Amino acid sequence: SDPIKISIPRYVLCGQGKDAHFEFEVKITVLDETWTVFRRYSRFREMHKTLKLKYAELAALEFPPKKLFGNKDERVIAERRSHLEKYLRDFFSVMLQSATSPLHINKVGLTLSKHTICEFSPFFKKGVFDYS
């Protein structure tokens, strides 16, 4: 009844020195299949810019800006985690509603599986550190 579930349960520190940055643990579930990808903010933002020019309705979504107080402060990172989570959830909400989308709700007896999502955007494909 609710075909695509997503959460961001935690964020992890990657890299060493000043090249160290945060990635977000994205847990995705479609039907009864779950997998997890690690994605930094930049990758979310590029995903949004890329997909917005292909599906105009996404422009009604507010993407979270990166915040000028303290990239060093984990409280900032935690707020960002919450916001990215809400964003992904709304992203799929819109993509389930929009008729010209490959994700649209009319495929939910048919062709919507891990595969539809993974192909829909390289953002959701299992790459290196990602896992199922």
Concise account of the structure shown:
By secondary structure, the chain is of the alpha+beta class.
What does this entry look like structurally?
- The protein is α+β, with helices and mostly antiparallel strands.
- The chain has one domain (1-132): Phox-like domain (PX Domain).
- Helix content is 33%, strand content 21%.
- The chain is built from three helices and three strands.
- The chain has a three-stranded antiparallel beta sheet with strand order 1-2-3.
- A hairpin with a 2-residue loop joins β2 (21-30) and β3.
- The chain is globular.
- Interacts with RAB14. Interacts with PTPN21.
Features:
about 130 residues, alpha+beta, PX Domain, 3-stranded antiparallel β-sheet, 3 helices, 3 strands, about 35% helix, about 20% strand, globular
Summarize the topology:
Elements: E1 4-14, E2 21-30, E3 33-39, H1 41-52, H2 74-97, H3 114-120
PDB class: lipid binding protein
Keywords: endosome, trafficking, lipid binding protein
Assembly: monomeric
Structural class determined from secondary elements? alpha+beta
**What do we call the CATH topology?**
PX Domain
Radius of gyration: 15 Å
Specify the biggest β-sheet. Answer: 3 strands, antiparallel
